Amino acid sequence: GSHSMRYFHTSVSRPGRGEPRFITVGYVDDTLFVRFDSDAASPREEPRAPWIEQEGPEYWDRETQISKAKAQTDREDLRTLLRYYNQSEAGSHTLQNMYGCDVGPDGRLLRGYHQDAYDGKDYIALNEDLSSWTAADTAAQITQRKWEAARVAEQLRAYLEGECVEWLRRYLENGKETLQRADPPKTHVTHHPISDHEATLRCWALGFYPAEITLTWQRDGEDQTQDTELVETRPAGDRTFQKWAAVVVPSGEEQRYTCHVQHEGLPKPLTLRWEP
Amino acid sequence: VTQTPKHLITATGQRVTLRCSPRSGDLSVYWYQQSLDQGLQFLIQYYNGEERAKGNILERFSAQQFPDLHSELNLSSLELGDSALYFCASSVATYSTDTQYFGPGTRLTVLEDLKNVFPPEVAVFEPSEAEISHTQKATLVCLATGFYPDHVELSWWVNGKEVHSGVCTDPQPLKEQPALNDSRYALSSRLRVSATFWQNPRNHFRCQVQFYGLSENDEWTQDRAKPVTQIVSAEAWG
Amino acid sequence: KQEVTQIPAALSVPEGENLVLNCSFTDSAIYNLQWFRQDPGKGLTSLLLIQSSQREQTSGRLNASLDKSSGRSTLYIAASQPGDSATYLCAVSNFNKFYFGSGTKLNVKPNIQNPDPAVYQLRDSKSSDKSVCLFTDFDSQTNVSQSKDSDVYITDKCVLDMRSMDFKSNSAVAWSNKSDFACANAFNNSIIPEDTFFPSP
């Protein structure tokens, strides 16, 4: 139902090893479609989805000229933050930025995003009203007053309320076969004996899109959320995702444990058990 | 934003220097050239002492931003086409969401030779009694004639104080003979006051024309007097 | 390649009338678009800055649109005042540099309540060898025409504001060095209102 477009940016300075490295990626929901790496021969914005290759050369020239300008601005900001935090010029530091917009089934904006981070910690972020900022410390307050004087929020508000939602809906129509149709998971339960009196049941979910899924084990109607080992949802490598959950079950009582999976591509939540 | 100099009359082959002072707190300076054939053209942009953006600036144009954020522009080996308005702009930084603030502008005129430079002759014309009887107001006309080039600033001065209300000045100077030979320019101006104020004989009217021509530094070998940057005035009484 | 064009070149309109100034540009990848007014002297003064993704901006009587797809901008001036008379420049900021338009000159003609046209011969100065003729207090609808002879020189029309009396007046000037000069026959070509007071001496 809900859809989103996101752009991620990462800049890490390499003092003595050359220019700072800049890598940016774009996502429509959980699907990568554009990328740009500063450490390539003649770096240019490259496509990563079939439905984005339909854009004209003027589109690619703009996106390349935007990513190369963002890399230049990060070099100025990385040197500026050294003055703000009294840091040394011989240390490697990291600048991160993400901006994007969420839209609902109506096709209108629900939530806007724009935030920066220095060395893994928050720096300055755009509030949800798309008109104010929240600074993390007094150094970010220096940037906050400059961004308020230059009326930076007004351009972002116009972009997030306008071109972000409009071009996301364009992408959702051009990639209507892959982005608007969800792939349900393929479920099964495996059995792995640990000892004579203890065993483990593993509930699998393979090949599902998007990444949002919930795997919960249940002891006769009550969840074993404390005794359940869950792993981070991992990408399979073909734009699909995988997740599994496991429980330590006393041997002989395997039929009192049930796995419950919920996903958008599923018609109704699933209930699956170990079939011998 | 301030600029220097204001006016600048020179010959072909010479060299000029234009300086600019941005607003305090501004780190970016911009140079523009406004010519009749190309309009307003962007020359170069400096930001915090380093060159940032560059337009179609010629090789014989040299610029620089100093550590005090002031900027300089050297125009060398001047040609007739370099005659234009040179503007300086400044911004707080390089923000795409912010505006620039322009200065007054430096007017450069490049001639082949300084032989045809002439100062103006000015003369005020007192109002007609028919108008005094028909409209109860008096109009003073000030004619400036026989000057070249058109670097003239006309102003009215009543009782030693400049006045701006009720004053009209022609927008552009008029060429006397519109032909191939570089003809001299003309300029008229009007000042309207109350008929009672014109009747009173203790008030003084003065039409001042600030003419920009040659500086004393330039050489002059002609027999007539040097057409130096001077002020030509004309007065009238009630 | 970016090319900014502004139509029309000039514009003379009566005060109070709403204006539509158009601006077109060929490169859509712009950071913003500004509208400047240029008055002789001060120079360029910014009026409206439309952000890259903004589609409209407003400030008092000024209302400007922006459509980057078409490559078009339009400045709407509401209730034109005589102070608005200036040249209006359309500026655009691209990746490499900034581009300005050709410009649109604006002349907001005021309204004269009572047209009292009259041609007056002011006294010749002792310093000068010419006599001056003044066409003044005419309506802002008269199209002043240039002279037929090259010995008589006619100026373009012009308005003055007597703010103390809240009075505005047009004025035109003509002069000639030949002694066969008569102010009744000076503005011979220009169509003169037949109610013009000719105070023949």
């Binding site: 752009y7 774009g26 703009r62 996106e63 935007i66 990513s67 300008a69 601005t73 100025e76 900001d77 500026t80 933050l81 703000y84 901006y99 920066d116 940037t143 400059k146 961004w147 230059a150 930076v152 351009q155 972002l156 972009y159 071109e163 972000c164 071009w167 | 930084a93 390089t94 923000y95 795409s96 969401t97 | 990848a29 712009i30 950071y31 890259s52 993704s53």
Partner: peptide, 9 residues
């Protein structure tokens, strides 16, 4: 579509 804006720290 990416946003066209320069806003240095």
């Amino acid at each position: 579509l990416r946003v066209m804006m320069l806003a240095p720290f």
